[PDB]
Amino acid sequence: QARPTVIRWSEGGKEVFISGSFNNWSTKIPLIKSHNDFVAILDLPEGEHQYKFFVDGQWVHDPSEPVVTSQLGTINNLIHVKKSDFEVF
């Protein structure tokens, strides 16, 4: 079960994308420009996901978010998605 999740890239650049473990590093999703900033909203299942940005042609992490080292040895950002069980009530 997935949540809408806001991802904001605020270190600037001209063209931003995100990819991550949530889609097995299979595709990049564009981030929309808005006042120095790039944002996307992602449908992501509860739990922890690793992710990284493709900014002006370079794979880069957000230095303001937590990071982790992959099985491949890469530095990826980590997001925890909270469970939304029973939030209707």
From Swiss-Prot:
Phosphorylated when associated with the catalytic subunit (PRKAA1 or PRKAA2). Phosphorylated by ULK1 and ULK2; leading to negatively regulate AMPK activity and suggesting the existence of a regulatory feedback loop between ULK1, ULK2 and AMPK. The modification Phosphoserine is found at residues 21, 34, 84. Coiled coil: none annotated. The modification Phosphothreonine is found at residue 74. Non-catalytic subunit of AMP-activated protein kinase (AMPK), an energy sensor protein kinase that plays a key role in regulating cellular energy metabolism. In response to reduction of intracellular ATP levels, AMPK activates energy-producing pathways and inhibits energy-consuming processes: inhibits protein, carbohydrate and lipid biosynthesis, as well as cell growth and proliferation. AMPK acts via direct phosphorylation of metabolic enzymes, and by longer-term effects via phosphorylation of transcription regulators. Belongs to the 5'-AMP-activated protein kinase beta subunit family. AMPK is a heterotrimer of an alpha catalytic subunit (PRKAA1 or PRKAA2), a beta (PRKAB1 or PRKAB2) and a gamma non-catalytic subunits (PRKAG1, PRKAG2 or PRKAG3). This is 5'-AMP-activated protein kinase subunit beta-2. The gene is PRKAB2.
